[PDB]
């Protein structure tokens, strides 16, 4: 019954990063991972010592729920637009074997097909902001659910913009008609020190996305548990 | 100072939220009448105010400003006429006033309380105190010479199988025994009945020449069976008075009953005493304290000095003997040592300790449910160890209520229970217990405890029950001092959870024998068939589609004939209650593990081995047998009565090894060709106007017992309920030997008692753990 395992996209400074850890430790979170933005613009490879959370945090994550220490993981988010950049992921898989759970962000439906079948990742980043044309096809979804591949839905609609509220709820329901809810997680990015929600608050926010009446609670608990369970055998 | 100022707010957050929930429980919508505890609520508080306490009445007098015919008949003669039908015990006016009275095979007795106390009876049994009224257990006194009262009964108890009573020499003076009787020595394995047996002989003669007595404690379904067998085995020979005895017994007092005849050759005097004295089973850890504190021994030194005006001279002649005077002090000293004993779970096996008791309504505390813990003094360590190790009170065991003329004089005085209640209103004692004692009720009683779960090694002392034996005239007068100490009293349903959580079968009819169990199972079949025809269809689940003949527990006239037809083709209703063979059967089903050589431990201190040829020799030695099995569900199960035990397949063991918390497979439905004869019957019934076989009854039970269901069914469950002791579903029922040894031969490997069960209202197989604890 490992509950409230979500991921954050957060690096600017150690003061803003530790504030999100202490806030997530306050609410319900027992597994908090930090994502890294890697794109085709700068083409940087910082894999070996990106943050070193265990060498900077003061050794005591304490929650007020189960009262257990937090397993802090390191995850990677690769923004892929061109198929020439997708071949970089197949080259760094044997050079540096870190970043236990790998998440990729596709943009083309031809590249989305090889991401669900041929590309060896763990989660799929699906964010549609400010008129991003990307339609969903049913055979690449039906292979990824049998493989065990998950799909992300990263939201932050409540603070920045009101126009961005509509693209997060409309692009979600285009996926709900096809995927049916076999492995769907809903994490949230946080740049400001207060851009996170409560542990039981996600259970209605998944029902706000629709998708279920009871299994939306399992989208933050059960489907998030399968990310570390499937990604552990990929590393070893 | 924000970290300091936040502490004052969070401290008051723990104060205000605690005071908002504590005052509101005492407020109850600002009402005085609902502030009372829920056990102490009466709905007649508005008609008469006298049903309220004194301190709560003063507020209700201020609330009164803001907010059928008479009966003049002799009620004693009314209840005398009503006693001609039933048996009508002395404590019937206590029980019928606050219990659901249901007429049964004998008389009407208390079964369920009017207040909901199902969780309260178990809670008053492992922690608090409890007591019952079990007076239907008859007794048979047998007076005769010592050489004749054993030769006529030696071929009835089967010495080499169960517990003996004849020459065991330890159950004689010290304690009682418990065993199962049978028929004559021709060895039929047909008729059987459990009897808690008592020996006592006089110590100072020490020879087989005096009068030797022994009692047969039995069940009223066996009262027609045992009394006609002992007769066949030994020798083929004004004022308003309270009818303390029976009217059925006194109406048959001249022709037949009580059966008190003598035998010419053997000298065996059969004394039938069905209702001669009453019995109360006192069960609990705190039941050992209220038996000690409320009951006080009779002062033999006060009366016997100079006061001699009135009879009870039978105790005066006892006080005249100086040996009985010093013996009564030893009987009280161990009885006062019982207050040092903390629980009746550690006292070896059914001890007997009788003494003389001055009646405990002399104290009669004013408060109700006045429960007290132990005193903080815990001295006399050497005196407690003397009784725990040896436990030989032969001098102190003096069952003085076994005399005929003395027990008559106990009842002959005919004391009034209401006139003594006026004595506290005449003397007007505010807080003292002052009763004048020139002549009191100095009559003895008997104290016998009973251990629970001796064969089962799970709890070892669950049911710790004392028995207070006493004559017929002292009924409710001895009942009422226990009520004001904190005792919650159950009934027959509480007498049913006494055995099913102790893993022993119930004594009326749940074990299948020939004269007794066939009459109660048919009576059990008449109650639920009336309930089955009471409910209209589309509300109950059908039984042809799901399972087999259920919840009617009589296919074992042909089920035990079928399991012998499966094996032998390639004396009836036998129960293997032989504890020498049950030690072997406990080794096969009980330990189900493998580390080096044996189950759950490598030394074992026993004999581990696989021999299938010796198992087939047991089946040819005892054909058509039936053995009870205690079984334990692992998770996600709830056993009902009359559920079927089914043999698992090879695919059931592979799925549970692959996945933990795996629910069992479902049941494929069966075809019902009997539906076409229903519209044939309904259209013929309406034709003849202008054999009742509707939805699960048919007289064709032969081919279904062979192979009907998907999984092969082998056993039933009689006591099906979820346990408050273990914490899960614990069923209790009966299987056959050939059903076990066919499953046990298939699995010499890992876990063996993992056997699925299927309730008849469902279609879901659920697995339990078979373990025979003998």
């Amino acid at each position: 019954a490992v509950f409230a395992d979500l991921d954050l996209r957060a690096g600017s400074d150690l003061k803003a990063l530790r504030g999100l850890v202490e806030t997530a430790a306050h609410l319900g979170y027992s597994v908090v991972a930090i994502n890294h933005i890697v794109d085709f613009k700068e083409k940087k490879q910082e894999i070996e010592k990106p943050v070193a959370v265990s060498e900077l945090f003061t050794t005591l994550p304490i929650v007020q729920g189960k009262s257990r220490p937090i397993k802090i993981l390191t995850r990677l988010t690769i923004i892929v637009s061109d198929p020439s950049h997708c071949n970089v992921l197949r080259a760094t898989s044997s050079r540096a074997r870190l970043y236990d759970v790998v998440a990729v962000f596709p943009k083309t439906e031809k590249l989305f097909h090889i991401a669900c079948t041929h590309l060896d990742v763990d989660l799929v980043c699906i964010t549609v902001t400010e008129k991003l044309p990307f339609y969903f096809k049913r055979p690449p979804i039906n292979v990824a659910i049998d493989r065990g591949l998950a799909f992300e839905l990263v939201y932050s609609p409540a603070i920045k913009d009101s126009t961005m509220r509509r693209y997060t709820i409309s692009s979600a329901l285009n996926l709900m008609q096809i995927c049916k809810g076999k492995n769907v997680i809903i994490s949230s990015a946080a740049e400001r020190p207060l851009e996170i929600r409560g542990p039981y608050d996600v259970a209605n926010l998944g029902l706000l996305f629709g998708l279920s009446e009871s299994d939306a609670k399992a989208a933050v608990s059960t489907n998030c548990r399968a990310a570390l369970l499937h990604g552990e055998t990929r590393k070893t | 100072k924000y970290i300091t100022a936040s502490t004052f707010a969070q401290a008051r957050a723990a104060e205000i939220s605690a005071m908002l929930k504590a005052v509101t429980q005492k407020s109850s919508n600002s009402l005085v009448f609902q502030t009372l505890p829920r056990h102490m609520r009466r709905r007649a508080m508005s008609h008469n105010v006298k049903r309220l306490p004194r301190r709560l009445q003063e507020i209700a007098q201020k609330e009164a400003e803001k907010a059928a015919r008479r009966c003049h008949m002799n009620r004693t003669l009314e209840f005398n006429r009503r006693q001609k039908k039933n048996i009508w015990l002395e404590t019937h006016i206590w029980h019928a006033k606050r219990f659901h009275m249901v007429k049964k095979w004998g008389y009407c007795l208390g079964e369920r309380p009017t207040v909901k106390s199902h969780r309260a009876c178990y809670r008053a049994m492992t922690n608090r105190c409890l007591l019952q009224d079990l007076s239907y257990y008859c007794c048979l006194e047998l007076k005769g010479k010592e050489e004749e009262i054993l030769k006529a009964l030696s071929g009835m108890c089967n010495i080499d199988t169960g517990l003996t009573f004849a020459a065991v020499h330890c159950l004689s003076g010290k304690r009682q025994g418990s065993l199962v009787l049978y028929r004559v020595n021709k060895y039929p394995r047909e008729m059987l009945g459990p009897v808690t047996f008592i020996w006592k002989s006089q110590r100072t003669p020490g020879d087989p020449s005096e009068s030797r007595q022994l009692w047969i404690w039995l069940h009223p379904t066996l009262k027609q069976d045992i009394l006609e067998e002992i007769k066949a085995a030994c020798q083929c020979v004004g004022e308003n008075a309270k009818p303390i005895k029976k009217i059925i017994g006194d109406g048959t007092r001249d022709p037949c009953l009580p059966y008190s005849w003598i035998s010419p050759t053997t000298g065996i005097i059969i004394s039938d005493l069905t209702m001669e004295m009453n019995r109360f089973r006192l069960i609990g850890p705190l039941s050992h304290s209220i038996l000690t504190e409320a009951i006080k021994a009779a002062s033999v030194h006060t009366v016997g000095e100079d006061t001699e005006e009135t009879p009870h001279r039978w105790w005066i002649e006892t006080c005249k003997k100086p040996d009985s005077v010093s013996l009564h002090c030893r009987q009280e000293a161990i009885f006062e040592l019982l207050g040092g004993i903390t629980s009746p779970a550690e006292i070896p096996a059914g001890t007997i300790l009788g003494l003389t008791v001055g009646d405990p309504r002399i104290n009669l505390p004013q408060k109700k449910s006045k429960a007290l813990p132990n005193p903080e003094k815990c001295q006399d360590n050497e005196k407690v160890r003397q009784l725990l190790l040896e436990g030989v009170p032969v001098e102190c065991t003096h069952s003085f209520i076994w005399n005929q003329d003395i027990c008559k004089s106990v009842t002959e005085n005919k004391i009034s229970d209401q006139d003594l209640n006026r004595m506290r209103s005449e003397l007007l004692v505010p807080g003292s217990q002052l009763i004048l004692g020139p002549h009191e009720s100095k009559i003895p009683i008997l104290l016998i405890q009973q251990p629970g779960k001796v064969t089962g090694e799970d709890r070892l002392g669950w049911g710790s029950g004392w028995d207070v034996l006493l004559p017929k005239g002292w009924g409710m007068a001895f009942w009422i001092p226990f009520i004001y100490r904190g005792v919650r009293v159950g009934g027959l349903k509480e007498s049913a959870v006494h055995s099913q959580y102790k893993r022993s079968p119930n004594v009326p009819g749940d074990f299948p024998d020939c004269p007794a169990g066939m009459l109660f199972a048919e009576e059990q079949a008449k109650n639920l068939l009336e309930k089955y025809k009471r409910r209209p269809p589309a509300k109950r689940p059908n039984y042809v589609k799901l399972g087999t003949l259920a919840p009617f527990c009589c296919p074992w006239e042909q089920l035990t004939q079928d399991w012998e037809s499966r094996v032998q083709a390639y004396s009836h209703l036998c129960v293997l209650r032989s504890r020498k063979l049950l030690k072997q059967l406990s080794a096969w089903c009980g330990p189900s593990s493998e580390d080096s050589r044996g189950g759950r431990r490598a030394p074992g201190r026993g004999q581990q081995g696989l021999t299938r040829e010796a198992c087939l020799s047991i089946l040819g030695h005892f054909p058509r047998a039936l053995v009870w099995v205690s079984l334990s569900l692992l998770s996600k199960g709830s056993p009902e009565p009359h559920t079927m035990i089914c043999v698992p397949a090879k695919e059931d063991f592979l799925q549970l090894h692959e996945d933990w918390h795996y629910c069992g497979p479902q049941e494929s439905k069966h075809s019902d060709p009997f539906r076409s004869k229903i519209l044939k019957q309904k259209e013929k019934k309406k034709r003849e106007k202008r054999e009742a076989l509707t939805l699960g009854l048919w007289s064709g039970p032969l081919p279904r017992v062979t192979l009907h269901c998907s999984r092969t069914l082998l056993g039933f469950v009689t006591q099906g309920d979820f346990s408050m002791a273990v914490g899960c579903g614990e069923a209790l029922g009966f299987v056959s030997l050939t059903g076990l040894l066919d499953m046990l031969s298939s699995q010499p490997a890992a876990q063996r008692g993992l056997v699925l069960l299927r309730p008849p209202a469902s279609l879901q197989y659920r697995f339990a753990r078979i373990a025979i604890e003998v």
Binding site: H26, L194, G198 | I3, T4, T7, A13, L20, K21
Partner: protein
Amino acid sequence: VRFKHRYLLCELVSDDPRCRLSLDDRVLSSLVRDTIARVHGTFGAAACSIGFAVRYLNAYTGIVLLRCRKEFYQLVWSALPFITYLENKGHRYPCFFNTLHVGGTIRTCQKFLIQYNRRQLLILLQNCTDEGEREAIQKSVTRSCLL
């Protein structure tokens, strides 16, 4: 002849504690009823206004108790993540956080507030490590035993 209610708890977890001093029942009723009209339309703005009322609020502590029906608890409990920008004289950014959705039954809703309060002061012992504040914790334990 009676209505089945639902009682949901909330907690303001934020820095700059002048926002916690600016709490009122008139502001909170004008905040929740407005943000339902911003997320949902005029349907949920009045379907969650016929039973909605405030009952329990401590500005120094930060626990919010709200009323809602059996048929309309899913609209209030889904509008809780979208509550930002509590506009006042200063610059404030609070955000509510649920603890446990209690189905009616005020008594055990206050019982969960006690066990949440007891777990907060025990963790606060070693993390703060102040001599003047530890004596104030001993004033909280002693007065709680007197209850």
